[PDB]
Design a binder for this molecule. Structure first.
Ligand code: ADP
Ligand code: ADP
Lengths: 302, 303
């Protein structure tokens, strides 16, 4: 068993990905080589990759896509890339064509969890509560059924880029133009205030298992929630996970306001440093970091 | 401008991909090259690709993916692959990484439109009428909130393979078993009877224009126009669905008409393209000649 870890990426989460890679490389219980996608889209192999890792950021790459990589030398690929060209299903589509088993959600799941509008339409139809929202498409004026404040976001970007809180309708047009700077589609959802952010990890292929619930405020593991609400969080996370057909893992984020839960999004490739929420959550669930990585690889083969 | 046409594929529609590719080449108003993906997954380039088109099939190829192809000499890529590794977003995803403009639906819309279960969830949520249904995954006992008869089918496949009609609830298990032979997930929906199958094509990015409506008819063929009394309603539903799903380039949308009630069945992101295929013909009757259709499709990939 030899594993290929791909880190970096052209997205803003480029340095975070390399951090996660540092953590995975030191604990994965399998011979593993690193491949880095520089911020310019080019790749770095072997030594140059490890050198880039130490630098904690690789602005320039050597080989343009597709790289002269010896794919036959690996049994499983672990795409530890965040955001665009990472969790959207493109790298996965590539790996599919290479006939390479890999860690994480497949093309459909990735592309779908990544779209804030489509995933919401699917989850709402299945009975999973989501914040009231409306989709706005580049070129056609907005129609918002509820009143401000809103939160405007690009539908398929990530890393909070292009996101803004709108207090009045008069500021809506400018918020959409900002979001459209990154996407052809945007979402306008009700701004919850005050609100609490809860996060829960899921592991498995389609029918997964939830880890304990966490809260972002500093990460509070576990979250100070009453018995019933904690159960619903895990329950809703497993339901949405199954409906979307996610494979491998996912960190599901929820908002809690007025005692009500709303599933915000499913992150198919969450931060993976030994101190990130997903790993810490499962550590709390009795699954050590090395074992977590072992399971992901095992899941990729089934 | 230089276009790159990719045809064949590892799916069971390999032969038909080549046929529509033959038609495309005969009329595409741009210098165009052909690249073929054999049934064994290896790519055939240059004259070998055209030689392959000749035989109407390419069992084996020369270059294993990724092919040593000069993508830089092409402005637009036209993927004419069907089903798996065709319209499921995989090829699309690869093209997105090569930073190459391409015809048709993007990664998400393609993956989404190929999943009967997922696209029906989105459409129903959006108000678009669909046949009642439930998803059944391999591993969980089937629970159907309605009585038979009903059709059982693989959620993600090609040429209606693995589809069956169930009259007795005691025949559901065998139907699901058949369906699970092509996918890990299946759809169980209310069987419409009698039913008429309509189809309308769509061109454009997100906000498209509908073609006239045609009606399918199998002999013991498509009727353009369709003997409807409704065509408007079908076109509105098609464009609405097209928009919500965020489809780009094109799509043939199939509907079921029963008891005066319309039901959108599915959106095909990569319809057959022979001069006589349902998509090209529908648009022809809509004033969009075959060469024009191709021209626009290629230009749309750039906008
Ligand atoms: N509907 C909302 N109501 C209140 N706050 C929100 C809402 N949506 C987003 N936010 C705020 O913006 C932040 C980022 O939203 P998010 O969708 O998670 O962006 P990203 O997908 O990049 O992580 C959240 O942590 C939250 O504080
Ligand atoms: N709900 C239904 N009611 C009646 N007939 C159906 C129904 N679903 C499918 N069929 C029949 O089965 C055939 C194949 O189903 P379909 O979804 O169109 O497969 P495909 O995606 O290959 O076109 C249809 O052409 C239709 O005649």
């Amino acid at each position: 068993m030899r594993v290929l870890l791909i880190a970096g990426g052209v997205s803003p989460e480029h340095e975070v990905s390399l951090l996660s890679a540092e953590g995975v490389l030191r604990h994965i219980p399998f011979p593993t080589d690193l491949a880095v996608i520089a911020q310019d889209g080019r790749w770095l192999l072997g030594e140059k990759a490890l050198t880039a890792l130490e630098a904690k950021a690789a602005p320039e790459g050597e080989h343009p896509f597709p790289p002269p990589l010896s794919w036959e030398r690996y049994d499983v690929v672990f795409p530890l890339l965040h955001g665009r060209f990472g969790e959207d299903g493109t790298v996965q589509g590539f790996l599919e064509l290479l006939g390479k088993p890999y860690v994480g959600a497949g093309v459909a799941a990735s592309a779908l969890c990544m779209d804030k509008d489509l995933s919401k339409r699917v989850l709402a139809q299945a009975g999973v509560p989501v914040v009231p929202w409306v989709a706005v498409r580049k070129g056609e004026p907005p129609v918002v059924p509820f009143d401000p404040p809103f939160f405007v976001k690009p539908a398929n970007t990530g890393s909070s880029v292009g996101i803004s809180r709108v207090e009045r309708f008069q500021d809506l047009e400018a918020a959409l133009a900002l979001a459209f700077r990154y996407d052809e589609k945007a979402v306008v959802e009700k701004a919850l205030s005050p609100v609490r952010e809860l996060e829960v990890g899921v592991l498995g292929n389609v029918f997964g298992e939830a880890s304990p619930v966490g809260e972002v405020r500093e990460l509070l593991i576990p979250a100070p929630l009453d018995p019933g609400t904690q159960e619903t969080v895990q329950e809703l996370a497993l339901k949405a996970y199954k409906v979307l057909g996610v494979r491998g893992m996912a960190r599901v984020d929820f908002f809690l306001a007025e005692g009500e839960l709303y599933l915000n999004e499913l992150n198919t490739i969450p931060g993976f440093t030994p101190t990130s929420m997903y790993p810490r959550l499962f550590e709390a669930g009795g699954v050590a970091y090395p074992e977590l990585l072992r399971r992901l690889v095992e899941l990729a083969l089934t």
